[PDB]
Design an enzyme around this catalytic site. Structure first.
Site, PDB file in Angstrom:
ATOM      1  N   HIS A  62       0.813  -1.216   0.000  1.00 45.65           N
ATOM      2  CA  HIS A  62       0.000   0.000   0.000  1.00 45.65           C
ATOM      3  C   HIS A  62       0.850   1.271   0.000  1.00 45.65           C
ATOM      4  O   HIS A  62       0.319   2.383  -0.041  1.00 45.65           O
ATOM      5  CB  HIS A  62      -0.935   0.014   1.211  1.00 45.65           C
ATOM      6  CG  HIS A  62      -0.245  -0.236   2.516  1.00 45.65           C
ATOM      7  ND1 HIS A  62       0.044  -1.504   2.974  1.00 45.65           N
ATOM      8  CD2 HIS A  62       0.223   0.619   3.454  1.00 45.65           C
ATOM      9  CE1 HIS A  62       0.659  -1.418   4.139  1.00 45.65           C
ATOM     10  NE2 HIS A  62       0.779  -0.140   4.454  1.00 45.65           N
ATOM     11  N   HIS A  92       7.034   6.934   5.370  1.00 50.04           N
ATOM     12  CA  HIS A  92       6.412   6.551   4.114  1.00 50.04           C
ATOM     13  C   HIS A  92       5.599   7.733   3.615  1.00 50.04           C
ATOM     14  O   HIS A  92       5.472   8.745   4.310  1.00 50.04           O
ATOM     15  CB  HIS A  92       5.489   5.342   4.316  1.00 50.04           C
ATOM     16  CG  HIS A  92       4.374   5.592   5.282  1.00 50.04           C
ATOM     17  ND1 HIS A  92       4.494   5.364   6.636  1.00 50.04           N
ATOM     18  CD2 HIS A  92       3.142   6.122   5.098  1.00 50.04           C
ATOM     19  CE1 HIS A  92       3.387   5.748   7.245  1.00 50.04           C
ATOM     20  NE2 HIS A  92       2.551   6.212   6.333  1.00 50.04           N
ATOM     21  N   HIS A  94       2.037   9.135   1.050  1.00 51.16           N
ATOM     22  CA  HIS A  94       0.701   8.922   0.504  1.00 51.16           C
ATOM     23  C   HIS A  94       0.692   9.913  -0.650  1.00 51.16           C
ATOM     24  O   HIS A  94       1.150  11.047  -0.492  1.00 51.16           O
ATOM     25  CB  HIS A  94      -0.371   9.305   1.517  1.00 51.16           C
ATOM     26  CG  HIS A  94      -0.386   8.428   2.724  1.00 51.16           C
ATOM     27  ND1 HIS A  94      -1.122   7.263   2.785  1.00 51.16           N
ATOM     28  CD2 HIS A  94       0.288   8.512   3.894  1.00 51.16           C
ATOM     29  CE1 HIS A  94      -0.899   6.669   3.942  1.00 51.16           C
ATOM     30  NE2 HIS A  94      -0.047   7.404   4.631  1.00 51.16           N
ATOM     31  N   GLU A 104      -3.449  13.203   2.939  1.00 49.75           N
ATOM     32  CA  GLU A 104      -4.514  12.643   3.760  1.00 49.75           C
ATOM     33  C   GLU A 104      -5.144  13.776   4.543  1.00 49.75           C
ATOM     34  O   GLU A 104      -6.363  13.948   4.518  1.00 49.75           O
ATOM     35  CB  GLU A 104      -3.949  11.568   4.672  1.00 49.75           C
ATOM     36  CG  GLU A 104      -3.402  10.400   3.868  1.00 49.75           C
ATOM     37  CD  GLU A 104      -3.405   9.101   4.634  1.00 49.75           C
ATOM     38  OE1 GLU A 104      -2.745   9.024   5.688  1.00 49.75           O
ATOM     39  OE2 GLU A 104      -4.068   8.152   4.171  1.00 49.75           O
ATOM     40  N   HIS A 117       4.841  10.803   6.192  1.00 56.07           N
ATOM     41  CA  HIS A 117       4.588  10.407   7.570  1.00 56.07           C
ATOM     42  C   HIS A 117       5.818   9.774   8.183  1.00 56.07           C
ATOM     43  O   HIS A 117       6.291   8.747   7.705  1.00 56.07           O
ATOM     44  CB  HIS A 117       3.441   9.404   7.636  1.00 56.07           C
ATOM     45  CG  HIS A 117       2.109  10.010   7.347  1.00 56.07           C
ATOM     46  ND1 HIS A 117       0.997   9.264   7.033  1.00 56.07           N
ATOM     47  CD2 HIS A 117       1.710  11.304   7.338  1.00 56.07           C
ATOM     48  CE1 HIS A 117      -0.032  10.071   6.840  1.00 56.07           C
ATOM     49  NE2 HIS A 117       0.375  11.313   7.019  1.00 56.07           N
ATOM     50  N   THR A 196      -3.767   5.718   9.763  1.00 53.21           N
ATOM     51  CA  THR A 196      -4.694   5.951   8.658  1.00 53.21           C
ATOM     52  C   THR A 196      -4.863   4.729   7.764  1.00 53.21           C
ATOM     53  O   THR A 196      -5.552   4.784   6.750  1.00 53.21           O
ATOM     54  CB  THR A 196      -4.266   7.156   7.807  1.00 53.21           C
ATOM     55  OG1 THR A 196      -3.007   6.878   7.187  1.00 53.21           O
ATOM     56  CG2 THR A 196      -4.135   8.405   8.685  1.00 53.21           C
ATOM     57  N   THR A 197      -4.215   3.632   8.142  1.00 53.61           N
ATOM     58  CA  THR A 197      -4.345   2.374   7.417  1.00 53.61           C
ATOM     59  C   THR A 197      -4.702   1.322   8.455  1.00 53.61           C
ATOM     60  O   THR A 197      -4.401   1.484   9.637  1.00 53.61           O
ATOM     61  CB  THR A 197      -3.027   1.929   6.749  1.00 53.61           C
ATOM     62  OG1 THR A 197      -1.966   1.959   7.715  1.00 53.61           O
ATOM     63  CG2 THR A 197      -2.683   2.831   5.577  1.00 53.61           C
TER      64      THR A 197
HETATM   65 ZN   LIG Z   1       0.739   7.223   6.539  1.00 55.56          ZN
END
Ligand SMILES: [Zn+2]
Length: 258
Positions: A62, A92, A94, A104, A117, A196-197
């Site tokens: 992801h 990581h 997004h 996000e 993040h 958030t995952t």
């Molecule tokens: Zn994240």
């Protein structure tokens, strides 16, 4: 089937396997700058990354994670709204399929091209696994990316992505200095939230920096060449791996600046 960001397994479906998705302190959220409360009690952030030891970069399906040695207090975050010492374990991003989306968190409904993040865990809990089960277990530093001038410190990450194109692939990634990803100012907004995952655990103290960093169109374009899938499987470009804003509910966003 397995959760993801597709039409049949996207964020709107997560609650079926992870009920906490409809919880009281879910992330991300929209930061309304006019409703945020300036708190003079908040201390400046203390980022000590001079002794950081990066180890590897991995495509986790992801997103891709840059992992660090967290067996000692080498790269830590303290101060701000935090009590105690938090060790950096991985960072990581997004991002979106277009420059107009990807972050996000949003600021007054504004979306950025991507969001970085930096994940840290509270050392009083011994290990990351124990930390995620506590309300004050993690501290995540969120940084917005806007498209413009290239970010020199990010190129080393960009150039290795070809070697970890598919899920499960990893590559040695040593001597990377995360300080090259930080903006000039450390002013921030903070609020209690969640991962958030999935598992979407509500164990995060979010620290979102006000100043975005700029990256070039070419740099973000390379992020969009990654695959959600593993080698040999049907290709699915890794794009739009962001969760939309969640209800703020009974929470207050505080600002370290006025
Ligand atoms: Zn994240």
């Amino acid at each position: 089937h397995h959760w993801g960001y597709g039409k049949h397994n996207g964020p709107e479906h997560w609650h079926k396997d992870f009920p906490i998705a409809k919880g009281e302190r879910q992330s991300p959220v929209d930061i309304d700058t006019h409703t945020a409360k300036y708190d003079p009690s908040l201390k400046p952030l203390s980022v000590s990354y001079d002794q950081a030891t990066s180890l590897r970069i991995l495509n986790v399906g992801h997103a891709f994670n840059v992992e660090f040695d967290d067996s000692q207090d080498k790269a830590v975050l303290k101060g701000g709204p935090l009590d105690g010492t938090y060790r950096l374990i991985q960072f990581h991003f997004h991002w979106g399929s277009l420059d107009g989306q990807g972050s996000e968190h949003t600021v007054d409904k504004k979306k950025y091209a991507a969001e970085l993040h930096l994940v840290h865990w509270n050392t009083k809990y011994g290990d990351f696994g124990k930390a995620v089960q506590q309300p004050d277990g993690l501290a995540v530093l969120g940084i917005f990316l806007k498209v413009g001038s290239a970010k020199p410190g990010l190129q080393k990450v960009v150039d290795v992505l070809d070697s970890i194109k598919t899920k499960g692939k990893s590559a040695d990634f040593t001597n990377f200095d995360p300080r090259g990803l930080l903006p000039e100012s450390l002013d921030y907004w903070t609020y209690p939230g969640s991962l958030t995952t999935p598992p979407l655990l509500e164990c995060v103290t979010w620290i979102v920096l006000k100043e975005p960093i700029s990256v070039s169109s070419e740099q973000v374009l390379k992020f969009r060449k990654l695959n959600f899938n593993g080698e040999g499987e049907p290709e699915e470009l890794m794009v739009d791996n962001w969760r939309p804003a969640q209800p703020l509910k009974n929470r207050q966003i505080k600002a370290s600046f006025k």
